[PDB]
Amino acid sequence: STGSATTTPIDSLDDAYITPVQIGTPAQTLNLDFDTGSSDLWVFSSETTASEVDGQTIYTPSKSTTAKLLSGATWSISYGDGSSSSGDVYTDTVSVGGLTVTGQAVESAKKVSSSFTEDSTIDGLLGLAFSTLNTVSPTQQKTFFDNAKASLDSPVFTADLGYHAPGTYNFGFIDTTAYTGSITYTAVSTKQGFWEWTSTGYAVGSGTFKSTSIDGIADTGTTLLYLPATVVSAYWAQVSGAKSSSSVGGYVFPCSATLPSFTFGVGSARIVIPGDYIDFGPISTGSSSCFGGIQSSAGIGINIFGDVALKAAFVVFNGATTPTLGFASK
Numbered sequence: 001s002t003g004s005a006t007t008t009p010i011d012s013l014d015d016a017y018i019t020p021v022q023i024g025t026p027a028q029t030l031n032l033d034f035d036t037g038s039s040d041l042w043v044f045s046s047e048t049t050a051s052e053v054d055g056q057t058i059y060t061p062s063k064s065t066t067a068k069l070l071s072g073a074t075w076s077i078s079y080g081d082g083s084s085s086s087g088d089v090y091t092d093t094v095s096v097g098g099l100t101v102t103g104q105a106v107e108s109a110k111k112v113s114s115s116f117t118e119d120s121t122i123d124g125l126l127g128l129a130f131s132t133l134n135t136v137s138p139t140q141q142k143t144f145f146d147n148a149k150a151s152l153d154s155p156v157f158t159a160d161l162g163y164h165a166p167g168t169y170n171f172g173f174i175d176t177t178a179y180t181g182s183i184t185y186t187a188v189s190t191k192q193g194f195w196e197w198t199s200t201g202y203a204v205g206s207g208t209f210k211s212t213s214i215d216g217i218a219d220t221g222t223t224l225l226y227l228p229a230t231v232v233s234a235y236w237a238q239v240s241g242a243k244s245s246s247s248v249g250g251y252v253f254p255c256s257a258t259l260p261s262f263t264f265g266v267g268s269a270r271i272v273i274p275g276d277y278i279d280f281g282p283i284s285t286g287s288s289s290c291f292g293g294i295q296s297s298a299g300i301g302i303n304i305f306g307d308v309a310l311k312a313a314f315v316v317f318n319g320a321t322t323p324t325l326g327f328a329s330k
């Protein structure tokens with residue numbers, strides 16, 4: 001079996017991507033943020049605290065004839081950005097573009113943090129990292145990809161995120177028309193539960209490729225590219241007027257600048273992120289100072305190849321016996 005769904009940026013800045021998901025019987029469509037950096041499928045629901053719901057579409061388990069309360073199960077997650085959500089669990093039918101899973105754990109939110117309330121376009125998350133990170137207690141649950149993997153034509157899923165444009169999430173197959181050249185595969189470590197790999201280095205614009213091992217995760221749920229401070233300082237040093245602002249919380253640059261591109265290595269292959277992808281607009285409404293898309297990972301603990309980097313490539317998340325990551329230019 002296969003699944004194919006269109007993913008859309010939530011705003012003009014590509015702050016996040018949403019993808020329609022059908023839950024329950026009859027189908028209740030929720031626009032979820034597919035997240036390769038987490039492993040909980042959670043949604044805004046009829047149980048969410050009234051004041052914490054602001055325009056999102058909710059899941060009403062009592063209206064699904066196939067929804068079953070998972071006895072004594074609760075979930076609670078805190079993301080790298082300081083955001084969080086928690087609640088109870090149901091098992092229900094979940095479909096993504098024609099691919100269906102019955103008995104999928106659907107984590108119903110009782111509470112969500114301010115940033116989730118503020119994003120009215122995000123109805124919840126669909127975790128695509130390894131099921132070892134799932135927060136359901138006392139009995140851990142599997143991801144949608146984990147539940148479907150055996151039935152797929154090929155145990156893979158691809159992320160083809162668009163820059164200011166619609167894109168695609170495919171399950172079970174590789175669309176050979178969705179990329180140029182070849183897919184270069186690289187080794188993955190599942191020790192921290194993430195699609196963790198090692199980049200072979202970087203270049204800034206037309207500069208010399210610096211060969212250096214950058215360990216990081218492929219994370220569709222994180223907007224920006226987070227890299228070591230030495231790497232990030234070398235990039236912003238090429239932009240006139242760019243500086244690291246402690247008030248803003250990262251590198252800012254004059255909005256009139258034309259940013260150089262950023263290249264990251266995948267084995268001997270190279271993925272080029274065009275400079276325009278690194279522009280995240282004014283720091284505040286009306287400001288002539290813009291926020292950067294490449295930031296330091298020094299206070300994070302790990303490097304994150306977020307949407308800024310992933311949207312420059314066709315990305316294969318290979319769930320074979322030994323998982324690997326594939327990257328191709330597009």
Ligand SMILES: NCc1ccc(C(F)(F)F)cc1
Nearest residue numbers: 079083115116119122221222
């Ligand atoms: N990395 C997961 C994630 C995704 C979205 C959000 C936000 F912005 F919706 F709150 C927070 C955390």
